[PDB]
Symmetry: C2
Subunit: 244 residues, 2 copies
């Protein structure tokens, strides 16, 4: 076993060295009202890592539209990061616009619990989704041998910002839930006056007293989430390999 | 912070009480040559949890065809588990065929690190993906307010089984990687007769010495993983709320 930050905790406070300079987490993002996704990869100039950075870069504007920043992490130097970014631009034709943390002592890695039994020296493929208050909302741990599904990271952030904004819980497989579709779930009643306004009216669909929902997300919001999943499901038209 | 099992560790040995009887983990699955996905939910008779059990049950045959079993987990009693399964069968017309662990003392929850800052008493939405050797391969921590995307759990298990069988690493967003499509990544050479036998005489595409791939998976394997993602992206034809 190892120790990790937990969902509901403030992301651990730290200044990190990146190829963009020194950044304080989570404050750099909190002070702009931004969410961030921090993700790790084992090493620069590795093929799975390179596919992931290109996947994040292609989705960069999707993240920026949600008000989400990206930051990467490995135990490599900032020099390594800059040369890898130049490799990706020269060979794939894609610019990596977001910072990468350089963690050559493993300090950030040990703090975030990103050293698993697959490697004592390089991080697994961790993801921390952190809201605009600096609180950890979701964590994914993918292994050395498997690339992430980046569209699922976009679905998580979008669904969580809708849940927070509309005061709703999000069903499995939203926005394509097999029971309620794009429906969002009404939380249990907090106070008794905000139990009567709901209980003593309709306006909610219900399977039982503990299971009610409505569809309060904008068509734009629902369609943006559905687009993430359609992109994840689409056979790519042209491969970025075929044009060096 | 809190402690968790790590990727590459043997799943912690434990006997658990389920609504199907007592099971030893991971030995119950390992002894059959099966993978298992252990996932947790905060409490029976909660609506997000209910949508996720229905999602897993609808995908149960997809898991069984991969040689993957499912097992759930909450702090509720086996009685609660049985009454909740009856509620789902009566109100949604879906049978939940897989066991749920009853953890009323929080023993399993504490050993798997499933008690986060969102609740001292109820697990978050944890997922442990465990191979047929009993080794942890991936871990997801989703929060109380957000349902999982179960088709990404299928993609992970399908991609890891293919990676293990074909001796390949899996790119981001496989099988729809924007650089190599359904390509799988050749790992760095094992022997010195490998770095010889495939150096120039290999049948690989390469972007660089450290980035080579081929497409050794069957169209059946690729299309199985693409169907997961098509299902995730499809607006349901019929919702299960307008029937029983």
């Amino acid at each position: 076993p190892g120790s990790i930050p937990l969902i509901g905790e403030r992301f651990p406070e730290m200044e990190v060295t990146t190829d963009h300079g020194v950044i304080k987490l989570p404050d750099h993002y909190v002070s702009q009202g931004k969410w961030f996704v921090l993700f790790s990869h084992p090493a620069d100039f590795t093929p799975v890592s390179t596919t992931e950075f290109v996947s994040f870069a292609r989705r960069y504007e999707d993240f920026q539209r949600l008000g989400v920043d990206l930051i990467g992490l490995s135990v490599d130097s900032v020099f390594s990061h800059i040369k890898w970014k130049e490799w990706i631009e020269r060979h794939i034709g894609v610019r990596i616009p977001f910072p990468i943390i350089a963690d050559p002592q493993g300090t950030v890695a040990r703090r975030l619990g990103l050293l698993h039994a697959e490697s004592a020296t390089h991080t697994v493929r961790g993801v921390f989704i952190v809201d605009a208050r600096g609180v950890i909302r979701t964590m994914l741990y993918y292994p050395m041998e498997l690339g992430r599904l980046v569209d699922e990271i976009l679905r998580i952030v979008k669904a969580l910002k809708l849940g927070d904004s509309l005061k709703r819980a999000v069903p499995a497989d939203w926005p394509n839930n097999e029971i309620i579709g794009e429906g969002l779930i009404v939380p249990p009643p907090t106070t008794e006056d905000q139990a009567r306004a709901r209980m003593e009216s309709g306006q909610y669909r219900s399977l039982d007293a503990w299971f009610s929902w409505d569809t309060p997300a904008s068509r734009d919001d629902v369609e943006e989430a559905r687009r993430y999943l359609r992109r994840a499901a689409e056979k790519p038209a042209k491969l970025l390999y075929e044009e060096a």
